[PDB]
């Protein structure tokens, strides 16, 4: 129950703290937790979405840093450039002229956070977001496609599975065609239990792109499988929520649930 988990968040965290998350949950979080957010029903323009999306789509370390940067610079952006165009502001304070290289800059373990820490930050990552994560991650691109297609079985006739995304998957989980021809999946990944670290990956051809996810116990209707590329596989969302793999020098797990996870930025 979301209200319960976000009411748990209220007590754990502080009124000044931010929760970083997608805007669809902006209001619920502010209501249940009584904390600040980056976006919400009333504030989710492209320029807005970029920051939650980045710290949800990029690699853990990159997301850890943006979380801190975006929060600190948005807060400050309430006292010139810092108003309207917060990414430029932070680039100057890092003397980076090229948007793409600064952003790539963030993935490095050797990135200095000059700006002081002024408040706590939490990541909120609900299961149900998978169904929309494709749209979430799209906003971490300045506007080179990605792939995050979730699907449920329509039928299972023969040794194949008629996935809802027009895809036809083999029962050994090693190929699909989409009504055409075979293309080996990079690896196989099945989630026996999220709350628990119950999963396993089977390497099956390196030069292959798409990963395949089997959600043996999806409590989410319409999300039984996930087909994703190497990038989405890298995201903090997949790695941290689904695979429950995270750096304990970057994040603290303060709320574990079947339905959602909450991490405390430690930086
Ligand atoms: Ca403070």
């Amino acid at each position: 129950n979301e209200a319960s988990l976000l009411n748990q968040l209220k007590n754990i965290a502080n009124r000044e703290d931010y929760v970083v998350t997608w805007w669809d949950y902006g209001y619920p979080v502010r209501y249940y937790s009584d904390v600040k957010t980056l976006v919400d029903g009333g504030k989710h323009l492209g320029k807005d979405n970029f920051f939650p999306s980045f710290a949800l789509s990029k690699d853990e370390q990159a997301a850890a840093n943006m979380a801190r940067l975006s929060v600190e610079y948005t807060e400050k952006s309430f006292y010139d450039i810092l108003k309207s165009d917060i990414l430029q502001a932070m680039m100057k304070d890092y003397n980076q002229s090229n948007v793409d290289l600064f952003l790539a800059s963030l993935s490095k373990p050797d990135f200095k956070i000059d700006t002081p820490k002024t408040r706590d930050i939490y990541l909120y990552m609900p299961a149900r977001m998978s169904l929309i994560f494709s749209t979430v991650a799209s906003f971490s691109f300045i506007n080179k496609p990605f792939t995050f297609s979730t699907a449920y079985p329509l039928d299972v006739k023969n040794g194949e599975i008629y996935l809802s995304n027009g895809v036809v998957l083999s029962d050994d989980f090693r190929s699909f065609k989409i009504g055409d021809n075979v293309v080996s999946v990079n690896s196989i990944v099945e989630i026996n239990s999220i709350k628990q670290g119950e999963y396993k990956i089977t390497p099956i051809d390196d030069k292959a792109q798409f990963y395949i996810f089997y959600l043996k116990d999806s409590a989410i209707p319409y999300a039984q499988f996930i087909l994703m590329d190497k990038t989405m596989f890298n995201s903090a969302y997949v790695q941290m929520f689904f695979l429950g793999n995270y750096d304990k020098n970057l994040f603290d797990l303060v709320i574990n649930s079947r339905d959602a996870k909450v991490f405390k930025l430690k930086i």
Side-chain angles (χ1 to χ4, degrees), residues 1-111 113-142 145-161 163-189 191-199 201-206 208-267:
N1 181 296
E2 214 187 26
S4 322
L5 175 152
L6 291 178
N7 180 258
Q8 198 166 334
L9 223 195
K10 206 170 82 135
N11 301 323
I12 284 160
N14 283 331
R15 307 306 114 246
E16 71 176 327
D17 296 342
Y18 275 61
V19 162
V20 176
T21 211
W22 199 233
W23 71 263
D24 282 28
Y25 323 123
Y27 283 125
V29 174
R30 287 166 64 175
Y31 186 91
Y32 294 131
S33 305
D34 207 354
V35 306
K36 288 208 194 97
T37 80
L38 282 180
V39 289
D40 63 50
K43 169 191 192 185
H44 59 90
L45 285 166
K47 44 214 285 176
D48 294 316
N49 290 335
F50 170 74
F51 291 109
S53 156
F54 194 90
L56 276 180
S57 296
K58 299 311 178 187
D59 38 286
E60 184 179 24
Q61 171 55 66
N65 290 345
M66 256 303 22
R68 182 46 77 179
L69 289 196
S70 66
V71 167
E72 292 305 354
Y73 275 80
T74 285
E75 194 72 8
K76 280 214 286 201
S77 95
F78 303 156
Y79 328 128
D80 70 308
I81 191 59
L82 201 39
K83 204 293 183 183
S84 295
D85 207 349
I86 289 160
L87 182 62
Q88 203 49 287
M90 53 178 84
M91 280 188 272
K92 288 194 183 183
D93 318 321
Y94 286 81
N95 305 112
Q96 292 254 202
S97 41
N98 177 258
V99 160
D100 296 309
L101 268 163
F102 168 80
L103 284 185
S105 161
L106 288 169
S107 294
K108 290 192 190 65
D110 278 84
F111 187 97
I113 294 285
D114 278 338
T115 74
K117 290 166 54 197
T118 46
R119 50 172 47 62
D120 280 344
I121 299 182
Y122 305 74
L123 282 62
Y124 180 61
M125 323 188 278
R128 59 194 273 240
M129 187 175 53
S130 60
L131 291 180
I132 54 150
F133 193 60
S134 195
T135 288
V136 173
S138 92
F139 284 94
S140 59
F141 299 66
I142 295 295
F146 55 93
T147 299
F148 198 88
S149 199
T150 64
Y152 48 107
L154 308 165
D155 276 305
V156 182
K157 50 187 179 149
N158 288 316
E160 40 99 341
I161 315 174
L163 284 180
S164 60
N165 54 332
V167 170
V168 184
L169 185 78
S170 182
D171 43 49
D172 74 351
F173 295 156
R174 297 184 181 195
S175 179
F176 49 95
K177 45 182 175 182
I178 304 187
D180 180 44
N181 287 305
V182 305
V183 41
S184 172
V185 310
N186 183 117
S187 316
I188 65 180
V189 168
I191 315 305
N192 311 305
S193 170
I194 295 163
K195 196 166 183 173
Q196 308 175 274
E198 297 191 19
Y199 77 101
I201 168 182
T202 317
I204 288 167
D205 176 13
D206 40 58
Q209 278 307 320
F210 304 25
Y211 285 70
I212 194 59
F213 269 68
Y214 177 33
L215 308 159
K216 191 168 175 156
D217 212 318
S218 162
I220 294 285
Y222 291 167
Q224 290 274 315
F225 278 108
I226 313 170
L227 193 67
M228 66 176 79
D229 61 43
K230 286 184 193 187
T231 300
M232 291 304 70
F233 191 77
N234 268 37
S235 67
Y237 179 48
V238 177
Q239 284 305 296
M240 285 183 65
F241 180 77
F242 283 103
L243 300 195
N245 295 316
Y246 62 98
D247 194 343
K248 260 168 198 182
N249 296 300
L250 294 190
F251 293 97
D252 174 358
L253 225 205
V254 301
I255 299 179
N256 206 3
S257 165
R258 185 67 201 181
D259 273 22
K261 295 200 183 191
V262 183
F263 288 99
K264 192 185 194 168
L265 199 55
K266 213 179 193 159
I267 78 177

